[PDB]
Amino acid sequence: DPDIFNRDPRDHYDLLQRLGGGEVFKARDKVSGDLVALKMVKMEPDLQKEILILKTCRHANIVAYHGSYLWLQKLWICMEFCGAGSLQDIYQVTGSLSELQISYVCREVLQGLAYLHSQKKIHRDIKGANILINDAGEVRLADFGISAQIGARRLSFIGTPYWMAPEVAAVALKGGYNELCDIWSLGITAIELAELQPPLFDVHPLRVLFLMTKSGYQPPRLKEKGKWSAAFHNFIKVTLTKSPKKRPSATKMLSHQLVSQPGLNRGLILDLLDKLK
Amino acid sequence: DIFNRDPRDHYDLLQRLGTYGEVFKARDKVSGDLVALKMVTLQKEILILKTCRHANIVAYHGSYLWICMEFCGAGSLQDIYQVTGSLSELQISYVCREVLQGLAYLHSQKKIHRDIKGANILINDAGEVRLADFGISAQIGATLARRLSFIGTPYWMAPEVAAVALKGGYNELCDIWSLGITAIELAELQPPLFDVHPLRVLFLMTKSGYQPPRLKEKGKWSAAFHNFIKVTLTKSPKKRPSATKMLSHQLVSQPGLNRGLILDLLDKLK
Numbered sequence A: 001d002p003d004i005f006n007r008d009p010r011d012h013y014d015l016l017q018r019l020g021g022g023e024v025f026k027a028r029d030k031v032s033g034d035l036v037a038l039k040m041v042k043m044e045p046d047l048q049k050e051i052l053i054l055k056t057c058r059h060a061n062i063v064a065y066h067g068s069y070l071w072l073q074k075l076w077i078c079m080e081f082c083g084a085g086s087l088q089d090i091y092q093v094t095g096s097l098s099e100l101q102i103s104y105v106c107r108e109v110l111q112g113l114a115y116l117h118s119q120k121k122i123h124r125d126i127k128g129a130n131i132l133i134n135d136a137g138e139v140r141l142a143d144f145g146i147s148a149q150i151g152a153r154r155l156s157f158i159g160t161p162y163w164m165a166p167e168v169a170a171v172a173l174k175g176g177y178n179e180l181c182d183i184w185s186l187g188i189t190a191i192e193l194a195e196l197q198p199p200l201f202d203v204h205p206l207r208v209l210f211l212m213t214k215s216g217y218q219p220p221r222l223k224e225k226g227k228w229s230a231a232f233h234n235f236i237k238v239t240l241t242k243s244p245k246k247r248p249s250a251t252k253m254l255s256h257q258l259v260s261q262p263g264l265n266r267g268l269i270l271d272l273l274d275k276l277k
Numbered sequence B: 001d002i003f004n005r006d007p008r009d010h011y012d013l014l015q016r017l018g019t020y021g022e023v024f025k026a027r028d029k030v031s032g033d034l035v036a037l038k039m040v041t042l043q044k045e046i047l048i049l050k051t052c053r054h055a056n057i058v059a060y061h062g063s064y065l066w067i068c069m070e071f072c073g074a075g076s077l078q079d080i081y082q083v084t085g086s087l088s089e090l091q092i093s094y095v096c097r098e099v100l101q102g103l104a105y106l107h108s109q110k111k112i113h114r115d116i117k118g119a120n121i122l123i124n125d126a127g128e129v130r131l132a133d134f135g136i137s138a139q140i141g142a143t144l145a146r147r148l149s150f151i152g153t154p155y156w157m158a159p160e161v162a163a164v165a166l167k168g169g170y171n172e173l174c175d176i177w178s179l180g181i182t183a184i185e186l187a188e189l190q191p192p193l194f195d196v197h198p199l200r201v202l203f204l205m206t207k208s209g210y211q212p213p214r215l216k217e218k219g220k221w222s223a224a225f226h227n228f229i230k231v232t233l234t235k236s237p238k239k240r241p242s243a244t245k246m247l248s249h250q251l252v253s254q255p256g257l258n259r260g261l262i263l264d265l266l267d268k269l270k
């Protein structure tokens, strides 16, 4: 907001495509030739904290920020371009990922969460659609629009219901919650990647919240049992823990068998980006 | 009385259309009638849609599991106003009158729609206005000490539905609020606060000192219409009028309301 450039962004950037719907364009720094992504939102001068959260980030797993432009009542946010788009854009064509593929993504997201949490920040919208893959098979985090800055417990009722932790769903009754909700959202996201839908996705979202506040609510499991390994079923069991008091941190999960086992690298995602042909 | 056969044995799948299971244009094999089929307490929508014989409620033909229903050619009002733009205060007024008749019959049947919105109001090629998608509709029965479920589409919900506190609950008068929001939607193409996160919208509706929305530009709209918004979007359910009561408001009982208005709108499309 204070480091905004009052400049037409088209001055130094060729816009190349429409990808969004706020709207999001593929662009190119004219002099540099470097690709970027410009998120444009129409702004009547009469929730822009996403800027505050990104400008202060400095991590490979978090989408990179380059500056914000404001022109003619239009707000443009310049960020790091990711060739293959979201994992949702991908898996919809590809089909469900392998366990190694899923394993890699979780390690990378947990890397981005660990950093983000130590910065005293929660994403609160971890889902396949907010995880971006660059042409080099790398993983980045995006859509910090509903993400929160702490400085100790959040009170807001927000998220995408299917991916929302139960302590968030019940926030109006159970009081504040904290950063362990991104770990729940990650577990759901693992299943999203495994089954192409999050659990209960055909249920009305508001109902899925109510259901998940019920006493005796059972956290989701993977459907095909034998299809996945012992290490994966456990990763789900523990990430999807109801009591946030008992649910592991990002740091503790990075040392889990599923994400600590060898073989995991940006290669498996390139192997996934091949199936897009 | 759900059939174990195949929906295609009576009908056809000739085009595709937009509500959970998708909609598909269809033709009766024997007579030549057009129907739309939806492809998916499982038997809840069909039980409400059966036991419904009213002009403003989309017809019901059978179910198998594809719920077979009357075909509407001009899709939803939402499909239409994405082409046409702001409906005129008259066309809105007709639609509202038409929807209230729908709701008044529904309430007298102890039914509540709970998802009144532009997207769920269907216009057939005859210019008839119908209400569809009873996927989250209620049927008040003999259940003792019931509290109605936390469900809907936030932008269109009445504040009393947004409450999850122990103290509260709602009745059929939630529909009258939804209708109010729908009128602004038909008028400004967006319900109020559409740019807000929908779960944040639910939170605001419950806070101390919430104010119902009103039409954003005053001059464009009459005082009957401005008033119509005011009363349908009454914050307190006790003070909010009923379907029957609304049908005699200045706006929906004014002279000039005939299907003709809808037919003109169906030419903005052509």
Ligand SMILES: CCN(CC)CCNC(=O)c1c(C)[nH]c(/C=C2\C(=O)Nc3ccc(F)cc32)c1C
Pocket (backbone or CB within 6 Å): A019, A020, A024, A037, A039, A063, A079, A080, A081, A082, A083, A084, A085, A086, A089, A090, A132, A142, A143
């Ligand atoms: C693969 C399926 N489709 C085939 C053309 C493409 C669909 N998806 C695409 O094109 C796509 C691409 C190539 N980038 C993005 C989004 C972002 C990006 O790159 N950096 C960001 C930073 C922040 C943010 F909020 C979004 C993005 C999409 C949706």
Ligand SMILES: CCN(CC)CCNC(=O)c1c(C)[nH]c(/C=C2\C(=O)Nc3ccc(F)cc32)c1C
Pocket (backbone or CB within 6 Å): B017, B018, B019, B023, B036, B038, B058, B069, B070, B071, B072, B073, B074, B075, B076, B079, B080, B083, B122, B132, B133, B269
């Ligand atoms: C993009 C705007 N276009 C209109 C100009 C869309 C074209 N037309 C369309 O999308 C469309 C048509 C022609 N029918 C429907 C849906 C239903 C219908 O007909 N009977 C029902 C009964 C129940 C129900 F749950 C849905 C429907 C759509 C979305």
